[PDB]
Amino acid sequence: AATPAAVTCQLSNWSEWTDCFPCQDKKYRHRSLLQPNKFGGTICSGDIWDQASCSSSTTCVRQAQCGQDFQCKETGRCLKRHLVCNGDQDCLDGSDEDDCEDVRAIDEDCSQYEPIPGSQKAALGYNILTQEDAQSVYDASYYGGQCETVYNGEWRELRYDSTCERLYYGDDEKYFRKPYNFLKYHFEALADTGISSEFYDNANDLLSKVKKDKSDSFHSQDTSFLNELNKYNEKKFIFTRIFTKVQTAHFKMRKDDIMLDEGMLQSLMELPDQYNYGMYAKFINDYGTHYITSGSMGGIYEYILVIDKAKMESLGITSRDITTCFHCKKFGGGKTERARKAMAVEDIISRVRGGSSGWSGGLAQNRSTITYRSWGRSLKYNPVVIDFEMQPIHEVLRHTSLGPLEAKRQNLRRALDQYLMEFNACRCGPCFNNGVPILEGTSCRCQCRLGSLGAACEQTQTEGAKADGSWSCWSSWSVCRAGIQERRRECDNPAPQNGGASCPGRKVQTQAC
């Protein structure tokens, strides 16, 4: 199809820099992304957030965020006193341990056990817009004086001792210590494989013909007539879906008295209680929009193949052909008709999540029992969060051990409601032919199906162009009716192509002002 305009990236001018925050001592400003370069074009060749060095007008915030609770030094973390001298470092400084004459608790039935492998991976924040994992939202490592252990059901590691000739299982890694931020980490092993394969073929072939003559001699002269309709129709559909997900552990994060990551604690205290969007958008950027509250560690393999071919041929003819001879004169004429419609579509997806790069890649390339076994073997060492339930990043504020932070929670909620739409892929325009808009923070592209691309996944040889629409971005909020507000959207970015699926969601939305 036609390309859109490769409209350039365009930013707002800089906002005026905030004062030199008393501790960071950095001038913060932002330039809003008015429009990214929809494709190609002049990129915005710079940051969206900038932070110049300074020297502060006044003292950093009171180095005394809590009474009686022991406060660490680099990090504002407040530890209940029994965590000081408990034999494990409850904050990055180690200030709770690194001067103890002796430890009030020794935990000699836990401190041998390493933290649950992959627990750090459930603690990450999550960028719904990118689906990238972000910096640690939860503390993956703080135990809060808990001595809780998780049975490592796959501890049973084969060993060989050439001296004894004993072939045996090494008892190492039998248990892992559960970090305090997990209410449960279940380690239940499951697999489910569902497969459906469907084949449909049709032909409908119909030759129909008449031929005719009348011819007379006393001169000898002929007339012949012909009429025919030759039609051919074919349909061939193949669909197969393979979905094999392998849970290795369920987990649920603690929702009461969450111990935030100390880096997050820093970044959060540092946030002013004033809606400077630049800072809040940076916090949403690096901690992301959401944090996981529950999920499953495991692997998923999904393979989908769709092939659809249709071929329709219709050939009509009529002719009249004549003789007169006694030297000869020969005559004829007629009508020829051909009409064709032919379309072929082949689309395969093979996505593998979890398991090592190499052995997941091997299963992605070539499904077999050998690659299922080596992939499952690699899932022991490198599982992934295969399903999860998440909350907006501002929602952790209400639940963190710091207690109420409501001004900052509201500010971050507003900043997020903005960010979710300012950086939304909706603004990467009409990726045709099921092309996938992605906004790479400042530069858009359409990830296309297995075919030609010039601008917007238009050049694809897909003249059987049955492909689904996608929404224009949500229009700006209405000038609210003093209490009620509306937002409008259309299935026009792209429009549903030649009968493709209409855009599934809301065409209009409404909000209390």
Added chain:
Amino acid sequence: QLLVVENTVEVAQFINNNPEFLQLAEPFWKELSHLPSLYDYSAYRRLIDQYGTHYLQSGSLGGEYRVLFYVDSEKLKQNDFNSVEEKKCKSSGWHFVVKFSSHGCKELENALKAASGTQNNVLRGEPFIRGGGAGFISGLSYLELDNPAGNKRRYSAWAESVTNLPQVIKQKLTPLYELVKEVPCASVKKLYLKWALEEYLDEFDPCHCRPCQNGGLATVEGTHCLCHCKPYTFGAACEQGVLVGNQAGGVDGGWSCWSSWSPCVQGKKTRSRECNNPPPSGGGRSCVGETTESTQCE
């Protein structure tokens, strides 16, 4: 059709001491201690629920292995061809009034073919094992269709492993009330437990279950009777499918529930049952047991 019926015993027996010298488990003795010392059947039933009706006076540990494997396949092919070919051709001509000729030659064919073929190929197998290592159990019980009894080596290995995780495959039983001991009112609780055993055997007596067809064993499961259909028979009554193997036929007679005890008149209780549930029919065997019991009054 294969049947494999197979036991390894390798604890030839255990013999538990008589109830006097047996040591009760701490939680069981605790539950006996909390029995109410009165016929509150709720408590004694909760006891018989957790600990059952008997204890093993003696028995042998081992493992059991069974394979029923059934292959039944029929192939039918029917093929018919017909063909009819006819010609009728005649000529008649004249030369003695006007020179004239006429000719007519007429052909028909009518071939027909009709073929039909049906296959059914049903294969069923249920290897069952108790005892032995879980891995040897799963390796051996996995039905290998070319060797459905299970290959020699794997049976070897399993029969070895059952040495180490043997299961009680044969037992002789003593009523659980015989263990009622070391507790306040033990002598009284022993009688109330005996009455609870009889009440429980009443409550769960399969007599309550109206018959299953095809010899399905009805069992009371709480308030309701399941029918455990014999192999390859199914449905709520086992009314459906077919029995494999050989049956003597008919319907075997099943006991009605015992009528309530006559109140020990002249010191003898008596009670009767009727064997009407079902009446033995079609040459099936009579219910097995006596029609009436009598006991000394309690």
Added chain:
Amino acid sequence: SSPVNCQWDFYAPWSECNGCTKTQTRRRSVAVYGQYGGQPCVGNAFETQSCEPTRGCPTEEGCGERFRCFSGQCISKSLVCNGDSDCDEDSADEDRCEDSERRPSCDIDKPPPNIELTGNGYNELTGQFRNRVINTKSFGGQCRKVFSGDGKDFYRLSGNVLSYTFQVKINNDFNYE
């Protein structure tokens, strides 16, 4: 075939009133057992009342001269600090007792490979083995070793068990048709 909806009987008269718990129970019979997938009876078979007892709760008779396990079971005082747990659950006979007092009561503690199963109760109607009823590892202070020729290992029998032996029998029916 036809289902038959389970129907509860009327409640029986209440139990006599428990001195220990000041309560009574009733029972409902199942008048008509559900059959052929007929709906089972719904709710409890029993209900309970608070009641003023006529009966005293019988007390425990304490262990007297014998050692009292924390559970309240009693064992011979000679078993205290055996080096063996003779108080079934609590091992209170081994509490806080000297490294001199605990004897090498036996050189081996390994019971035969599943002798715990010989102490389970049995439910004769359902045919299921039920929970642990006899303490089959009460060694009674004896070092009653037995050599299993089958497992080729020494096992310690409990003091009570009349015999435990390891001669194997293997009993194979093949029937192919």
Added chain:
Amino acid sequence: VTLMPIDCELSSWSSWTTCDPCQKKRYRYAYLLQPSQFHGEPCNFSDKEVEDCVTNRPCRSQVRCEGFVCAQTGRCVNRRLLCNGDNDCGDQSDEANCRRIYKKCQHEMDQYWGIGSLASGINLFTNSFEGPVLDHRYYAGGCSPHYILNTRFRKPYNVESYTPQTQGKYEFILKEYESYSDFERNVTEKMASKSGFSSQSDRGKHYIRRTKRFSHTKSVFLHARSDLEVAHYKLKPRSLMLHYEFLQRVKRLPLEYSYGEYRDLFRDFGTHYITEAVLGGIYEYTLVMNKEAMERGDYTLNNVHACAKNVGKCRGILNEIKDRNKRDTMVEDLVVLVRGGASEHITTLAYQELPTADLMQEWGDAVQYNPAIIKVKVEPLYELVTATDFAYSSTVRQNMKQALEEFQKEVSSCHCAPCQGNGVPVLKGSRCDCICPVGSQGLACEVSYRKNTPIDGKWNCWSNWSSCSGRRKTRQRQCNNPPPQNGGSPCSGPASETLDC
């Protein structure tokens, strides 16, 4: 188009309940009226508020401890458990300052494999394991060693027995059917006529009526199931040692009834605890395949022509048809379910081919160390609320009964709108997921290529209890009326229930 996003709605807040004398707090909650579905708005988290109070009311929460009160955890351990060498409190508060430690057992002892899994509560309605409710690392004395194979294990005090009642049961079923029918007819004719005198008259005819009619079907049903049982577990009936986290959370429960706080209890720890279980593994495989081939062939021809010679005039027609049709279809559904064992074997068993006996052996071996919980008998978690360690134990118990009854209602998936495609709606929380069978896809399972999809009927929520004189509930089956698309098995359970007030 058809599916339209359903936003989560939650109730107006309850009244503030009166300030709890012990918690010095007041509580309000919202019922979830309908879940978010089809990507509708997920409303918000935190359907419960707690406020500080000032209370003059007395609190008798000081449940006496004759034993040793653990310093950090406040567990009441028996005085005999000090200095036994076991951390029976938290933070060794019972082993701190011990003049001497009388190690109750010197040998190394394992915990039973997976035993701590069974100390979690189970959400019986979700059938989901939740936070820990029992302490299976509390031994009291213990140290009677239990040998399974060579490994001697220390049985938790909470556990009546864990025992290797090893068993297995494999069921294989393979039913193949084929049918074909294959009909042909070849009608054919000719005519020829001549006449002459000086004249000629030739009249030929041809006719063909050829028909072909073929239909082949193949069907395969292949179901395999291995049930493997590796151990049997029972919890003690009485005097259980609760987990710290659960102890606390229960102590936080108010005495005045506040549904939301108990709901949060169930959502953290679930509704029931496992009192007895069978531990094992399940492998199930089921392949359903149907194949049909159909061919239609129908050829017709005519010639009709004549010529007469006296000069010559000839006439003729040819007519022809060839109608040929060839419908062909295969539908193949394979579901593999594997529970328990190691990831490696779990996955290769989850491949689409039936396994080798080697792999089944390896898997069943692994299952012994990481068993699934095949069967549970469970008791409701309010039965753990006892006078021994909670004040107002009967009140907390009754409130948990009421909250459980309401929780069952609220968490029921029946609130979900019916999925298309014989979807199964599952209420994950404020949000309901349509689990789509094999051959069904998308948010509502709307995208399915299969021509027919039998809809097994889904009950609507049981209508509320009627008044006394036959307190009763009824259901309508309206939610997913089965008949559409050739409905399948109707709901087995009771369409209505009666209770004696």
